[PDB]
Amino acid sequence: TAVIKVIGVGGGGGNAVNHMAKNNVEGVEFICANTDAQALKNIAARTVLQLGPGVTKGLGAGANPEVGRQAALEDRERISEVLEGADMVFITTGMGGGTGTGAAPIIAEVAKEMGILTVAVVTRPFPFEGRKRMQIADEGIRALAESVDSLITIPNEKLLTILGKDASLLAAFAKADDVLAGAVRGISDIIKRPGMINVDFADVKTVMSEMGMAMMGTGCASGPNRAREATEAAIRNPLLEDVNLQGARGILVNITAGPDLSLGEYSDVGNIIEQFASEHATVKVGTVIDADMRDELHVTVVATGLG
Amino acid sequence: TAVIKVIGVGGGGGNAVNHMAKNNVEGVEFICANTDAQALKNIAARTVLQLGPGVTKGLGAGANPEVGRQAALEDRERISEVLEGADMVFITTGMGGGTGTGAAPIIAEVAKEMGILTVAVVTRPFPFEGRKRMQIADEGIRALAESVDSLITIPNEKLLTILGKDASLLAAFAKADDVLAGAVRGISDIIKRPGMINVDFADVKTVMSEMGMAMMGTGCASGPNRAREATEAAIRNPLLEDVNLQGARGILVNITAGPDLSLGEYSDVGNIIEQFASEHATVKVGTVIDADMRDELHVTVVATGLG
Amino acid sequence: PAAFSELSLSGLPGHCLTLLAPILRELSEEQDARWLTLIAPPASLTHEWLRRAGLNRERILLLQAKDNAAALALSCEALRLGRSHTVVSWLEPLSRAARKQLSRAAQLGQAQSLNIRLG
Amino acid sequence: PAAFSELSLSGLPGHCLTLLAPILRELSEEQDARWLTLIAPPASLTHEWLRRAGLNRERILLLQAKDNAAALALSCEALRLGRSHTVVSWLEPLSRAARKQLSRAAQLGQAQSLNIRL
């Protein structure tokens, strides 16, 4: 019955949240927080939070992170209200702009002050966006890590590897939206629609709470060796390339499959994970059964407390 | 399921068996074997076996054991027919006469040849019967002991003591009948009417098979400490006086009580007994619940493999 | 609270027996230091089956009865005496009256009355 | 032998649950290397209750369904898939044709169908 809220901050953050509200991310409440008043009009998210109407006058920020920060400081109270009652909050944004990089850390401070488990799921700018934005993003990320339990980072640069020849400007950000949705879905589902009884909210809190930086990888496969192929594919996902899985304090695994999931497939994923996880790590493997799913098997791995 | 047959040999044995048939002692087939055709007419047992029609011509053995033996030898065949199908045989007789002391050992041999568990429960003459019978009884008990798995030799002398002033010729032999019935019933109820499932026929065999000399004591009590009282009473029963429980290879214990038997009481009995038995002795404690019994708790202890 | 419960098992006889085992096994191990009393169970529940079902052989009492009417009276009595944490009956039919009788007897003995129906 | 079985419990709700626990606990430990699948059990059978009930946490799948009609359909599909040694349902009422469907699915999946009526 956990109350899970997802807040998209800024332009990119809003696009990801609206993409989540349209696809398959159930059991959560969606909120879009932005200084840009026009961007909050006619959107999927049921709740909107127009940040700093006095500092920005609804005109948005100008890619200036200070404006985003000041607008958030102005609405600490309204940020509290929109978050009231959550057992968990996902903060998603595209770091590198003004609203997202500036306001997210402040929104996180509030959530933390309220004792709410907080997981940030953000992207680092694409190399084509310039050094300036990458610098801004890095700073905002550093400020963010000071108040979130787990900070999942998605370097957009890696999305280009995944996309390959299918890359285009529209497809690149569309991919970012989808990856962010997979992160929120992978975790939220373990909490809201678990198929097994071995992982409860407390177990998730244990692998997420006060962990710091995190990263994820996803994979899916069909056929006779789908369990191993999906798991290995998640491990070698470029979004998890630069991470020493054995060096992570927490490991949350989401197995999503239809009723054709066999006991052996479940143990296969567990065995593969145990081989990469450190013995000093908290490992939780939650399972989600999609009653209408068949042949495919998805594996989502979130490595927390990296380093 | 186990087929249990009781064979009373001779006059006294016939009376003992007839008493058994008119009292409790359920689940067993009664047979009176005698050379005295006249004694086989007005009895309660349903099966009779006239021993040696050709030798004694149905007139009895005249107290000469040799005649009893010759009569039994004559009907070795009819004896096997009567025992056929039995899984256990109780042979009871008053040692000291002609038929019983002479035929009992032969009947035991036949039972032994057929591989039937054989338990003999017999008495030694009362001293008021004379030296001749006592001498004859001693020789017979030696012969019998060589062909039975267990041999309970009840000395009538002890019974005359237990009776005190109520002692009369008739009362004395009635007491013997009653004690004999107690031996048979105590052991057979464990096999035929177990209230618990911890002791099966195989267990009883372990305690009874090729054991040798045996003796039994009975006790009964009512009220708050009946468990301890009945057990102590069974152990201090004069029939077990000059018997060292710690020297017995096997110990079979029958607890008989009504529906008011407590789990604690069942435990006390076994505690008191394990206290007297050696760690190397095989101890079996069977429980028989008499649906319509109340307050009274009976304990029967049979020590086998004495010495 | 001490009371009356009823368990019914339907299906193939062998399936009904194997599904029964874990409950009887569990009951035989009850923390309450008293007996598990089974009253007039079907011929199928032999002492051998009970031992193979892994029941605690030192905490079970199995009593017989000539017929349903006798089993009913015996059941209430064993409950009444309060020497068993649970008295298991195999009565069918069982009237609302009989159930009340079993229930009352159970309360008096601070014990549980459990009737089982197979078929 | 694959088939349909039904277990019914009458009495205080708390008593019924207590009696049911040992069955589910043992079912979750079946030697058969397959799942114990529970289909839309009553609200009283929370994940917490099943854990506190001692069931093997790594060998049970719990699938929900909006109503009896859906639960019946999901039970047969689960049985049919053959991934569970036992598929436990909590369906009442249950028609003759319904039990027939369940027993056929059980045979197809070489599994056991067990319906529980509380």
Ligand SMILES: Nc1nc2c(ncn2[C@@H]2O[C@H](COP(=O)(O)OP(=O)(O)O)[C@@H](O)[C@H]2O)c(=O)[nH]1
């Ligand atoms: N997921 C996602 N990220 C985006 C999208 N557009 C831009 N971004 C990223 O998010 C960053 C922030 O830009 P923007 O959202 O415009 O900033 P803000 O509104 O001022 O916070 C950029 O540097 C991009 O990497 C989009 O449609 N989806």
Ligand SMILES: Nc1nc2c(ncn2[C@@H]2O[C@H](COP(=O)(O)OP(=O)(O)O)[C@@H](O)[C@H]2O)c(=O)[nH]1
């Ligand atoms: N239990 C019992 N023993 C008896 C009875 N009458 C005699 N005896 C004993 O059994 C012995 C054998 O005597 P009896 O049976 O007449 O001898 P048999 O028939 O020739 O073997 C006697 O020495 C007595 O001690 C009786 O009524 N009951």
